Design a protein around this ligand. Structure first.
Ligand SMILES: OC[C@H]1O[C@](O)(CO)[C@@H](O)[C@@H]1O
Ligand SMILES: OC[C@H]1O[C@](O)(CO)[C@@H](O)[C@@H]1O
Ligand SMILES: OC[C@H]1O[C@](O)(CO)[C@@H](O)[C@@H]1O
Ligand SMILES: OC[C@H]1O[C@](O)(CO)[C@@H](O)[C@@H]1O
Ligand SMILES: [Ca+2]
Ligand SMILES: [Ca+2]
Ligand SMILES: [Ca+2]
Ligand SMILES: [Ca+2]
Lengths: 447, 447, 447, 447
């Protein structure tokens, strides 16, 4: 019979495809949702049994900061995003830099009293620090244009091929903690089965964590000084914690965002895994790039199971890295703690954040929680306050300032109205998505 | 026991390798076939049960356009392709631009009356528009030298890892509709089994389609104008059809070649899938680059399951793209229609062509057809007619012209003879490949 | 039921993770082993049943060639490798060019009399010619910094994802035939099973070969001359031998290092596979780049299943290539001979070395040998003797020479002592690694 | 009243243009000279008064090493250089690596009993080490194709804009010390004057030197070690000598080729200029890159007055640099010694060679001499002796060798004949160039 990773293509399965999408249910060309400010919205609820097979998304979050000479009512029906340089003097929709950290993706299986995925939107899709990097790997990909790359909140395509099985229910939401709405395009593909999945079926989970600052004992000591390197750490009580979970399942990897402050090397710390409540780690690593399967630092490589998403050499002191344990998962029967020393022996006080991904049989024993939005924002240097004084104005300069202010007073409310109409579309299509997935479930089951 | 995508390497299978190849059966170094002009040639017939596991090919199609000072009899036994610049004055074997569209690959399973694969030779191997682009994906790859890249009919290496099972027969042919012969190297690897595959085994199919022009309602309206974007399309009656097939199986993706005429954006159109005869599509997409898992246009990325082969930004307005549904196949019990709006609500009148790939149980109920060769050629701009009138010639210039015409009269027929000899070798080795595959089948089965 | 290459993530397995690592068992930050000169060291022994799922390593081999103004006792506790340019005048730890060929990796299964893996350290990890190239493929990756690339013995991260099952025992050793010690970091991940693996389980094997020179009939004749191309070779008695193995299993590919001498093309030779003792090869290829799934030469491409690690165009005449037969393995019931013509019909006399990878049921019938160290070194051009005659020296020059020689006599033995101390840690941690793996085995089997 | 560097374009001069060129005096398209082996040839002799304003040249030197299937008599009339890769099997004209150092350019003014320019052909045109690099400066430029770059003896375009005035005579020669002829294209532009130049007119001079090895006191001591850096050198008696000349004039710069042996830094040595016989240098520099107006090493920059032609980072240990003193010339009334310490205080024993360029009033005091050809060749590493032995040959392999050897015995003399005919043209056109320059002089003087 047929063998290898393509073999399943050579046998038919009696499963029915479905898809949750931001498709324009008016039949028009607004195939995205305007996710409202300070709201949660359901991309869809699907009745099991089924499996999520693919997610694609993209997003934009602009703030209107100047009056436009583009008719704002007609402009709402043109392309979704005014990719127009502010130097032309005709419009200014500024980029919201941290929207990837202000929104969360939230997934709840089988009507549990906790989500199983609760990760900032960016970090889930391997955008760390609300700062995309172009890369491919086996389960996650980002396609980022060079014209957009190298800034906070750059638009880009994200895709996820991790399978997410569910016997009874899938509820996918976005939690928007932003004061701004944002545009979200999505295609969530799944298949529905005509019988239950086995009860030892492991469900997809993901959780996010941040230590900022890490509680270092020697942040002011030079990394790799003899004094630092001769400190011992066996038990790793103060290690950065990527994952700490009770259940039966397996860890399939992480992304790690590190903003490093001393300008040496943030990565001497060892991975240390604690399986099934052991006091001392049974899996001991050698270094943080070593865990990410690089060496002598991180490289500008992104390989199927590991590598760099954003390289410290391209930024103001921050790195985004990933490793996938797809063929080499870290299994546990009762408990797993995944840790990394934050510098050798937890020397350093850098800004670490992470997404852990794992599969486990239900139930999800502990609530997956997330730090509040004020705790999820990248650390960025800020310009000194620049309290400008206007010179003595000519009548002409005052008339220009007055005329501009008047245009702005008229224009902003007109754009606000258009955002509210699109938000109304998203809330309407949220309910239609679920209603259609229910009709599809029932028509499949009748068959 | 052993899990993950390498697990089948950890157990032995009592299956016998075979290979169809263009290997020189004189034992010499012409390990290619000269595929004759206007003929079909069988690369091999294999008696099942078995599975194609790997295909590699490369090719060259040169037209002799000037006399050479290279001895044409000896030249026939040197390297197969004279990669010599015309500026040297010694030979001129011009590139045939469109040979990848003029030749088809044709595969017939189990002695059916209809082929299951009928695709232009280029497009099958993800060469769109007879214009190769360097890329890797999980099932298909093209290795293209930068020296050869950016021209029609560039030589390059092609490789296909989609498995192709067959219980009774595999017959692989090249149909060459070209006025010219072409060089084909191939290695087609398979295994033979000592027992039948299950009768619900899904067999590999591929078909090709083109709409040139697409029947757009508004090709002269600016893409993304408010007027275009407020037109509705739910049922997709006039969508571009990628695949329209009757049977039980699953679609595994496509390549798509678009030549865009307006100079705006060709890709606002949504994928819309119609499963098992439903009137309205049950899978609704958001845009064409969104279907290819890019965003805000196509990017110069080629990832394992999707991306760009040829980028519009590198060409005279054409794009070649692909998506594989390997872990997220689109399944069907009775019928599948894969469609994409050609521009929003079928606004545009661009040139679209596509290869659809799918698996299905036999029999193949849909009779796969191909557009004729005159309908398969890229649309390219043509220089205006320049009606050169010779100046008054010196006798030395006339003598040069006559001497050159006499060398051409003597040379061209000597090249033709060498092509006829290689064509005879191709036809001979066609029969040998099938005889040897039969001997190997019978020797394997004799246990 | 869940299908495709990710499907094993959706089911839990009752297996216990272990890891052999160079972790610092003092709990400090020397998470590497100083592998002694001319010694074998056991990375670890693991009791089956289990499976190696992942290996990561990195390495350094420096030779102290000048006195340093860095305190050598304190230096031992700083970073492991002094990445300091000789031009600063403060230290000179020179790169040992060929340590990747001088050290072997050796793996023995189930306490057999013979190793199943015996390959130079570099070649095993797809470093050919002790000259790293940056690349990714599905089972092997090298992450090489551009600052280190383009030289012999460059440091880099290696990773292997080929699974290595074992019912009874795994013993992993480094055999260091170097006059110098070298730094090795490693993480070898595995899982332990609660029940035997099936008897038909195929075990991972690898073996290394070199022909330098190959026994060419025509090394001074131009490649692709008509005289070369009309020589016949059906039986391939004098072909380069990648693999010659007795048993039941399957070949999963090779790396090939070719130093080419005449400056034409080394790759006209066909792959010819001889299955189960057949006299003539049943699998006939077409060319050497063709076997590697490139065309018209090798390209600067590294794809999941094949390509270029080190390109001839970037070096002084040598190429490192690979092909993985993961979904298209070459199976054998009794015997397999993997050969490639060295040039068309074995014309050329180049320097060919290869690593063959295969799986087979035990016992290993074929005793795996390795050429001694003097036969493993890369062929490199050498500068002619420059017997320098000192000029007449001033008192101040003689005093500088004497002062420097004095600093060197004092300094070298102090560095020597620090190497010896690290070597004692390596021998200590070798035993500790095996003792912990045994404790872990026993606690898992008790549970 | 018009000012600035363009001002002379605004006034007419009653001067007559002339050109010495390799133009085909048959009127055909062989506009080059085949410079014979082991011969001198006069590019032209011009009667003064006049001034050389511009030289352009290019060249090729191929060695026939294999029989060709190109008709050699017809080939002589095609393009001049067969840019055909040896892998095609049809021709092999190998590159002669050191022809740039085997040929000299020799210029003699006013029938003096010494040339005033005697420099290897390459070095004069800022090709050091017979190894072109692409660059532009104000007086010299090299245009090198990237396809040809990175190899010894690469073809490229050279241009010189240093003015060369002469009151009575200019004689320009190539001295070909090579065993091989070479192709030379040239265009040498000049203007003739209707009155003598003032007798205090400074004439262009250039001379070449090499110290291989330099006579270092500490080649085995680490560069920038404290012991090296504390050695003193005020008087510079053992400094590398760029120029040592008696007369009245000014130095306008140099090129310098360094092959460095230690692998640290070759360039700590100071420039020291001795003007008018001074015991101690009056112009003291700081370092060798500092003299070339780089810092902390040489950079990949080539600026109007200084920089890098070939960067050590791109080669096997050698650098070619230049500096022009056009607005900042180093003047002398009686004598100039231009020196550079070869490493700090002449520590090092590297391979240094230089072209010095200067202007001086006549007479040239001392004969300009040049090291013989065996002393002009780049230092290159050599492959060990590959004492190949043929295997037992089949009758077919013996017949292939015999047929190839017979083809070679026939072919080589046919190519030799075509070289001899082209050499005859060069010797003929040498005389015609001087006869035409004389007829032009006399026609101008009559007018
Ligand atoms: O990769 C090997 C080692 O390289 C380092 O960068 C050395 O300073 C460490 O973080 C790591 O363990
Ligand atoms: O990727 C998101 C959207 O971006 C566009 O290019 C916007 O005009 C559309 O084709 C697509 O649906
Ligand atoms: O890739 C096709 C063919 O290209 C060549 O380089 C032609 O000389 C051969 O090695 C190979 O068989
Ligand atoms: O450019 C400043 C200095 O930089 C160096 O490379 C430093 O060692 C010297 O050769 C030079 O004098
Ligand atoms: Ca560490
Ligand atoms: Ca759309
Ligand atoms: Ca061949
Ligand atoms: Ca100095």
């Amino acid at each position: 019979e047929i063998t290898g990773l393509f073999k399943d293509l050579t046998k038919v399965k009696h499963a029915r495809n479905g898809r949750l999408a931001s498709w324009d249910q008016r039949g028009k060309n607004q195939d995205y949702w305007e996710i409202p400010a300070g709201e949660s919205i359901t991309l869809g609820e699907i009745e099991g049994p089924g499996c999520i097979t693919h997610m694609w998304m993209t997003s934009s979050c602009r703030k209107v900061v100047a009056p436009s000479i583009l008719d704002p009512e007609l402009n709402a029906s043109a392309a979704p995003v005014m990719e127009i340089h502010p130097a032309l003097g005709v419009i200014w929709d500024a980029y919201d830099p941290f929207y990837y950290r202000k929104a969360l993706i939230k997934i709840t299986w089988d009507d549990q009293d906790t989500p199983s995925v609760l990760v900032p939107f960016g970090d889930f899709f391997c955008i760390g620090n609300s700062y995309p990097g172009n890369f491919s790997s086996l389960p996650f990909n980002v396609s980022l244009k060079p014209e957009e790359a190298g800034k906070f909140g750059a638009p880009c395509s994200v895709s996820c091929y991790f399978p997410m099985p569910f016997n009874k229910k899938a509820k996918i939401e976005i939690v928007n903690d932003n004061e701004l709405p944002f545009i979200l395009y999505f295609n969530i593909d799944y298949e529905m089965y005509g019988e239950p999945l086995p009860e030892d079926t492991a469900y997809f989970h993901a959780a996010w964590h941040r230590e900022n600052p890490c509680n270092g004992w020697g942040p002011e000591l030079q990394v790799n000084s003899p004094e630092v390197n001769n400190v011992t750490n066996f038990k790793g009580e103060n290690n950065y914690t990527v994952l700490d979970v009770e259940g039966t399942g397996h860890y399939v990897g992480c992304n790690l965002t590190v903003k490093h402050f001393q300008g040496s090397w943030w990565g001497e710390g060892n991975d240390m895994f604690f399986i099934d409540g052991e006091e001392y780690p049974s899996l001991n690593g050698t270094g943080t790039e070593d865990y990410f399967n690089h060496a002598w630092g991180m490289q500008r490589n992104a390989y199927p199971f590991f590598g760099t998403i954003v390289h410290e050499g391209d930024t103001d002191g921050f790195q985004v890295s990933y490793r996938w344990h797809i063929t080499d998962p870290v299994r546990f029967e009762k408990h797993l703690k995944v840790t990394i020393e934050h510098g050798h022996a937890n020397q350093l006080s850098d800004d670490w954040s992470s997404t852990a991904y794992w599969y486990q049989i239900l139930p999800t024993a502990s609530r997956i929680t997330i730090a509040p939005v004020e705790d999820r924002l990248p650390v960025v240097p800020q310009l000194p306050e620049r309290k400008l004084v206007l010179p003595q104005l000519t009548e002409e300069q005052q008339a220009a300032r007055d005329t501009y202010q008047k245009r702005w007073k008229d224009y902003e409310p007109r754009r606000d109205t258009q955002f509210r109409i699109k938000e109304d579309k998203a809330r309407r299509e949220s309910k239609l998505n679920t209603e259609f997935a229910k009709k599809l479930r029932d028509a499949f089951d009748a068959e």
